[PDB]
Symmetry: none
């Protein structure tokens, strides 16, 4: 019941976002996080942004299909161009209603205008 930051994305793990095994593909997790961080940055940049680096990504617990994947983003650095955002991914519900932290990572964004600088 207690995630840090603001919930930016809350979706359902579709079976299309899997691997050969059937598991939720981590790649795809990383895509979900890139999107959510770009969201908070776009709130911050007051516009369109562009990602340049990602540090310290950790995949804590696996994700299954049919679980709700909640993304919680919280900004970290009062940087001029280096919009740094801390992103974690929590999964819900096998006993239904089970919350656990599934990803920890530190995203670094850079605000780009119609001409990024």
């Amino acid at each position: 019941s207690l995630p840090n930051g603001e919930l930016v994305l809350r979706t359902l793990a579709m079976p299309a976002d899997t691997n050969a095994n059937g598991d939720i593909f981590g790649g795809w997790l990383m895509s979900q996080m890139d999107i959510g961080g770009a969201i908070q940055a776009k709130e911050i940049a007051q516009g369109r942004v562009v990602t340049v680096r990602v540090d310290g990504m950790t995949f804590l617990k696996p994700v299954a299909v049919g679980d709700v994947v909640c993304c919680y983003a919280r900004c970290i650095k009062t940087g001029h161009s280096s919009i740094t955002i801390n992103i974690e991914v929590w999964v819900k519900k096998e006993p239904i209603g089970q919350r656990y932290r599934a990803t920890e990572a530190v995203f670094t964004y850079v605000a780009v205008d119609d001409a990024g600088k």
Copy 2:
């Protein structure tokens, strides 16, 4: 700033979901609603649920690309197997909060053979 029901789904409107004018085709909207509602319905029924009825759907305001679409569901009725849930579709960043869709989705708790089952209280 409190939504009456729970935010069950929050995604970004991607251009994959467009029409010829440029708004999001509300196929995609109804799918979002049905899934988002199914989540909380599944919270209640403690098993599989099935959409059985969808009434009074209104597309209040249009949806654009690159915007955040938020779905808020609040249950109203629990009958025999029926979980009735009122669903709202809000957009978060115009590019401002407005309700863009409202509807009443009605679900039914089922077994593996698609037939009714009681609601676990």
Copy 3:
């Protein structure tokens, strides 16, 4: 037997399913919307918009690999508004049975997304 125009003849794909094995009725409603938007665009001979969906019922489940057919009939031809009755009949690939019924409402819109009058044909 089906009344109206066959607007769509499509197959139930796995990509469109849930965990159960049946098609998520997200997908069905998407199909019915496409099917309505087509006839509406014929009537308005231009762009339309889904604005209202009433009395949708998911009668019978639909499996994967079956043919999904939508049958549409206009009922009301308002000033800009086109009302269309849509039904989904499934043919069995791998027998017709109607699995869903709904009443879609579209609106004749122009190129700038604003309502417009209805032609005569």
Copy 4:
């Protein structure tokens, strides 16, 4: 004029575009495969698998927002091999009619193990 029976009828969504904005042209092949597979599964009175595509012609291109109608007509059958000519016609709703595709699709009826199986004449 439209020779064959309508197996598939759908609308072109933008979800399926290329770089300029046209319909991705393998996707048509995806449709032809499904639609032909339909009449094949009709005849084989069971399941089939695609094995050959001969002489496919892209007569006229297709854009987004048009209705695509697929017509399957059988020509030849083997013990297991089903030959079907497919025509793809466009209505251009967003109502001019014209043929968009011609091809000869060949399928094979397989049993539970994946080997070909027999066909009753009727």
Copy 5:
């Protein structure tokens, strides 16, 4: 063993299957369309458009979790029509699962035919 240059190496995804569970052959042909259009755009040095597919053969089935390799080899040097021979080899032991002969046409920005330099 495989003939030509590898334009695509993609993984068979679940969403790409048919009802039985095999890889959808629609999808295979979809991948081949791309594999051919790549080499067609490289040869033509601009836009191309698919206009014909000859002798497409599905040799062996594919399941999910295999590596799909697309091999294109140009075969005929004409004025307008660019014919490209395409094979698909699957990994998991590599084996050729598909063969076909694609025919493309060089186009301008207006989807109209255009000249070929050193076709």
Copy 6:
């Protein structure tokens, strides 16, 4: 020409695009996790799981219609733990500035050979 093994090779598609027209990051990462996962399953002869992603830098943007290539190189083997350096290069620049191949992303990925119960397992050496 680049190092490692080509594990993934795809075309930059639309619908994976942003407002500007270049493909946004994270499809790129989807491809890197995939591309690495291939070679890891080949090497461990069984199931693996991404556990860590190190030092990712977005060097150059990628437009739509360009060829996206993954080259993976294993570097480290633990008892079960596999560290692999993954490279993403673009083969073709749209239609015309053809043959200008350039690396667009690189990172150091960490996967782990696990069983069906997701538990680590020894590595086939």
